[PDB]
Amino acid sequence: PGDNDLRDGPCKDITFIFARGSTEPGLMGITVGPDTCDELNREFRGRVACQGVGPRYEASLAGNFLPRGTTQAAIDEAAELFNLAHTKCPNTQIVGGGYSQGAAVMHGAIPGLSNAVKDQIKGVVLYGDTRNEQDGGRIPNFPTDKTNIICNPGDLVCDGTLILTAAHFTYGTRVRGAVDWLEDRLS
């Protein structure tokens, strides 16, 4: 899988739409985005398309202090990608993902999607979620049993302010658990 597969590749049975954080470069970032994509593909080999939220989402650090914790352009771009999966590949199983500010993108884009698009989203994994406290530990109007907010012990960004600590940068160790959780929701 690549980083622009939903826009530029054939439909796959599983489509991973991921919004990066800690302003890593590229559509997918460098750390947990590619890691999650790679491990999903190893569990469902050849059946996974991977898609980063970009390039209109620029993942700027200052964007964390906008009202929704990211730019409206980023939220719009993510929503367009979920809707594209729905029209281009109506049978694909969508997995949403975000890290840090990328979780704020997912918190903003998913609530407004149609019921039918939400039916296609089988799970959303949010690493180091900067909006955990602000949205009450869930994505608004999206099922909690399809939501996995992963907060490391000591990662204070999940407590309502942007206090960065070393624990915010260790989510590579949580990818195996994230993919185990996704497997219970994917076929």
Author numbering: 13 to 199
What does the publication say?
Cutinases (EC 3.1.1.74) are the smallest member of α/β hydrolase family, capable of catalyzing not only hydrolysis reactions, but also esterification and transesterification reactions. In this paper, a novel cutinase gene (McCut) from M. cinnamomea S168 was cloned and efficiently expressed in P. pastoris. McCut is an α/β hydrolase with a central β-sheet of five parallel strands surrounded by nine α-helices. The cutinase exhibited excellent pH and thermal stability, as well as broad substrate specificity.
The crystal structure of McCut was determined at 1.76 Å resolution in space group P21221. The crystallographic asymmetric unit contains one protein molecule. The side chains of Ser34 and Phe181 extend to the catalytic groove leading to the space steric hindrance. Moreover, two gatekeeper residues, Leu73 and Leu176, in McCut are 7.2 Å apart, whereas the corresponding residues (Leu87 to Val190) of AoCut are separated by 9.2 Å. The overall structure of McCut showed a low B-factor (13.44), indicating high rigidity of the structure. Structure analysis revealed that most of prolines in McCut are located in the flexible loop regions (except Pro46 in α-helix), which may contribute to its excellent thermostability. Hydrophobic aromatic residues Phe52, Tyr145, and Phe174 located close to the catalytic triad are important for the specificity of CLE towards the long-chain substrates, while superimposition of the structures of McCut and CLE showed that there is no hydrophobic aromatic residue in the catalytic groove in McCut. The close distance between the two gatekeeper residues and the space steric hindrance created by Ser34 in McCut may explain its poor degradation ability on PCL in comparison with that of AoCut.
